């Protein structure tokens, strides 16, 4: 089934993005131990942990559902909900890493030069874009959860929405990577 297969492709993208996100959290933590001694970093840490455990739980549940679904179509609407929640949670977590990079960048670099003004613009553009895509997916998701009970028209649409959100998230992840790399070359 192409639909089930698409769910698998999305789940696996989220999964791999989750490892990329955790890598950025670590790179930030290294930079933060080199640059600082908390000033909001205690809260930041607790937030990183909270979102990380929630994403894992949503990912695991989506793994559960991927198994059931492989062989009316409610298990795929339900899985879609969890994929959307995983993306929202990842987005929160990525916002945390953005806050972290900015804190550190301000300690050691002026915000002018070096591609930073562009970096800031691009972060704001894709943050707005992924929030709109998330909003569109939530509307679509609520609609799908209504049209069941009780076809797979809004299911394929939702796959499209989730994909676009994933793609915007990837742009944001490439930005945070660039930010972390700049800081690393600078003081590490």
């Amino acid at each position: 089934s192409g639909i089930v297969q698409q769910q698998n492709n999305l789940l696996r993208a989220i999964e791999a993005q989750q490892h990329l996100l955790q890598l950025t959290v670590w790179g930030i933590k290294q930079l933060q131990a080199r640059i600082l001694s908390s000033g909001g970093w205690m809260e930041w840490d607790r937030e990183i942990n909270n979102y990380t455990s929630l994403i894992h739980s949503l990912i695991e549940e989506s793994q559960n559902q991927q198994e059931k679904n492989e062989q009316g179509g409610s298990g795929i609407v339900q899985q879609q909900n969890n994929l959307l929640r995983a993306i929202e949670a990842q987005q929160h977590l990525l916002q945390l890493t953005v806050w972290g990079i900015k804190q550190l960048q301000a300690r050691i670099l002026s915000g002018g030069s070096g591609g930073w003004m562009e970096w800031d613009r691009e972060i704001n553009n894709y943050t707005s874009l992924i929030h709109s895509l998330i909003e569109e997916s939530q509307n679509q998701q609520e609609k799908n959860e209504q049209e069941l009970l009780g076809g797979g028209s809004g299911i394929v649409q939702q796959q499209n929405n989730l994909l676009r959100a994933i793609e915007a998230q990837q742009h944001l992840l490439q930005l945070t990577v660039w930010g972390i790399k700049q800081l690393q070359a600078r003081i590490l």
């Binding site: 192409g2 297969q5 492709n9 993208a13 791999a16 993005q17 890598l23 670590w26 394929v156 994933i166």
Partner: protein
């Protein structure tokens, strides 16, 4: 880990996501087409 390892893990995950996204894009088209035929 070291920062050299981190660099490698970053690139590997990025490459994997770009592949997954390319596959998801192709499947999206195949699903939308099959849905148009129906």
């Amino acid at each position: 880990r070291t920062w050299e390892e981190w660099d490698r893990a970053i690139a590997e995950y990025a490459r994997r996501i770009e592949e997954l996204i390319r596959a998801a894009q192709e499947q999206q088209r195949k699903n939308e087409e099959a849905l148009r035929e129906l």
